[PDB]
Amino acid sequence: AMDIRQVTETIAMIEEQNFDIRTITMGISLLDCIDPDINRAAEKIYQKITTKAANLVAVGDEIAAELGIPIVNKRVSVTPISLIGAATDATDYVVLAKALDKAAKEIGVDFIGGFSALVQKGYQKGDEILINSIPRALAETDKVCSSVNIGSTKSGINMTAVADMGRIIKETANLSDMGVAKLVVFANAVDNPMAGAFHGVGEADVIINVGVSGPGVVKRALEKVRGQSFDVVAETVKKTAFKITRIGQLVGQMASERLGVEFGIVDLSLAPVGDSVARVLEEMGLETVGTHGTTAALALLNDQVKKGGVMACNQEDEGMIAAVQNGSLNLEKLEAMTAICSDMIAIPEDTPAETIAAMIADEAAIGVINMKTTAVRIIPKGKEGDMIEFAPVMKVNGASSVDFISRGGQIPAPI
Amino acid sequence: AMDIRQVTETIAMIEEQNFDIRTITMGISLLDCIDPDINRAAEKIYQKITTKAANLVAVGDEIAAELGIPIVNKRVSVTPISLIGAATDATDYVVLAKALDKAAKEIGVDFIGGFSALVQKGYQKGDEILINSIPRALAETDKVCSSVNIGSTKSGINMTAVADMGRIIKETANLSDMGVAKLVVFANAVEDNPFMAAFHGVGEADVIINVGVSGPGVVKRALEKVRGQSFDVVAETVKKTAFKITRIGQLVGQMASERLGVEFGIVDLSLAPTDSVARVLEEMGLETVGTHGTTAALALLNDQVKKGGVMACNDEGMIAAVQNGSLNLEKLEAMTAICSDMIAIPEDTPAETIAAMIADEAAIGVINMKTTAVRIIPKGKEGDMIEFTAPVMKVNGASSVDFISRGGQIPAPI
Secondary structure, X not given: OOOHHHHHHXXXXXXXXXXXXXXXXXXXXXXXXXXXXXXXXXXXXXXHHHHHOOOHHHHXXXXXHHHOOOEEEEEEEEOOHHHHHHOOOOOOOHHHHHXXXXXXXXXXXXXXXXXXXXXXXXOOOOHHXXXXXXXXXXXXXXXXXXXXXXXXXXXXXXXXXXXXXXXXXXHHHHOOOOOHHHEEEEEOOOOOOOOOOOOOOOOXXXXXXXXXXXXXXXXXXXXXXXXXXXXXXXXXXXXXXXXXXXXXHHHHHHHHHHHOXXXXXXXXXXXXXXXXXXXXXXXXXXXXXXXXXXXXXXXXXXXXXXXXXXXXOOOOOHHHHHHHHOOOOOHHHHHHHHOOOOOOEEEOOOOOHHHHHHHHHHHHHHHHHOOXXXXXXXXXXXXXXXXXXXXXXXXXOOOOOHHHHHOOOEEOOOO | OOOHHHHHXXXXXXXXXXXXXEEXXXXXXXXXXXXXXXXXXXXXXXXXXXXXXXXXXXXXXXXXHHHOOOEEEEEEEEOOHHHHHHOOOOOOOHHHHHHHHHHHHHHOOOEEEEEEEEOOXXXXXXXXXXXXXXXXXXXXXXXXXXXXXXEEOOOEEEHHHHHHHHHHHHHHHOOOOOXXXXXXXXXOOOOOOOOOOOOOOOOOOOEEEEEEEOOHHHHHHHXXXXXXXXXXXXXXXXXXHXXXXXXXXXXXXXXXXXXXXXXXXXXXXXXXXXXXXHHHXXXXXXXXXXXXXXXXXXXXXXXXXXXXXXXXXXXXXXXXXXXXXXXXXXXXXXXXXXXXXXXXXXXXXXXXXXXXXXHHHHHHHHHHOOOXXXXXXXXXXXXXXXXXXXXXXOOOOOOOHHHHHOOOEEOOOO
């Protein structure tokens, strides 16, 4: 909601339907906290985050109060810590993760992201000390998340790193319960958010981005067009998405004003606060998520939502688990579905490191060849068909990938 | 390969590795055959193909003889018949298909494709009558291929047509033993295809040659030399083998064109021969195709091939992993995100499931600007062995009926 016409239309919308904010995230630059004395740097990071984001949760709560809608999460993201680490001689960067945990705790946010590295063109100074800090850092902090970007359409895939991330994912899991829940591997990150957020260099010193609701609101809108054609279904997804995005903008403009900070973007559509998605696709007229059709349906959802959102300038899930259990959702369906779209996949604990690497490789390839963002979060804990809690632990193909993953190097290009 | 030095170098290659020419195909426009009397169109068509392709097979043989490399196939491809059907009153265009099958038999090719409709934006005059001829066309011809293109990036997906195409597939299944093997459904069909599976695009030349060349074996032989080395090196190896294989194709296309008196068009991309794509992937170092890593491996293979192509200009392993359960209807489905099937399914499975299965592949290619191609063979039961290939696969039994029932057009995409 920018001029009065748009705010007003937006408040009209907040009346006829029920929307909710998934997150409000503030990104902070930490470049100015660079110090070759890593402890001085730890302190600079701290004062800074606690200053700039001092009011973030209060204001988030006020906004929720005025609009009469809930705000699930309030988060912060930051400059990839490897670049801060890099200015140092430190041999590990956990200490920097701790400045983040203590900042978070103090300002009351749920999570702070960006203990990250970006290693698609190869490891640069900082990258490996960062990545080998991951298992310890994620065990010794509660609110910090990490992400590592390992390929890009423009640089291809750094498989040296994908192989490390297999070993890393496992040391992270055996060193704490829920650490692997805060690590995500990516492709085509290098950006805003996401449980893998970080704040890109050459973004504002401080900005607020918000991501908004979705499924439930879309489910209620499809139910009104049962039996109706694909043309109708699609106009429906787009019009809902256009409103969903407007509310996001209203919340971001408000937030940005009260904090005296620029507003950046709003985005897009997962599922938390007792929401849907698997039900959204099923209401499109499939019987169970995962069956034949499901990938056209989610290509429909995604595409039209994207276009709804562009129409205003922009840019978990019980449905799913039941389908994993009744076995009509399958790991390779999900992989299929990442082709047109896209985490929290559970796999058995004993899964060899190279198998994790190849899952990642599989996912990054799709992302890379198809100019898409991909993001794996693998949890390897448990047995063949258990039930972790923070996920059904899924079937993993038992045929080896060792040789592959031992090769090393860079997969180039694409044409 | 155009200039005589290039010709020499290319001949040089044929001596080190052994190569296949998989197809040589002659594209033929049938617009001058149009005629309100469908019987006359039919004879005009039989005339045109029999003349213009009167030497195709002979020239294929001589060139194979001369270069000493085997030439598997010789085929023909024509104007989509929906266009020809359309200038007519007929209610079905099966008489056009029998024209093609008589022509195809007389010139002695393996197949002739073009009994087709481009229906991405929706049915135009001609298209349904054509589509509805397919079950019958394909029961009563031996050498005709049919294909229907049902969306594209540019126009999104004709979900009416995808639903029909469910019914059609079954109808064709139930009308003959192997009718279904010659029917393909598609997304992003490019007027250039070839590779059969395949039609001659309107505004392409009156007659053209294109050739498809071998691969998997040569690439697999090339990879065995680099066991243990990094992906940088797998990528180079794969690119340079792909260079050569393309040159052979250019040269085989240049001769065919010269002798036939016909322009040369483009050259192709790799596919099951005698060795498998499956073994190639395993050689990159996966224990069984379908396991984790496979879609990255097909990504590398595919990309490097494509770029060895531009640096020149223009089964076994598989079935086996279907059985050890190491390959998956959905895994194949995933791999089509990054590249490019003969899949048999049980025969009782409903039309909506087949359509939803088309709809899924159509979406992969439509949003990714990739070409996609489903040939579903619904015969027999959960586990059989339908050897025209083989085996019958699991199919989700959660209904897709309601989705498929909506009809219409899925738009866009952005």
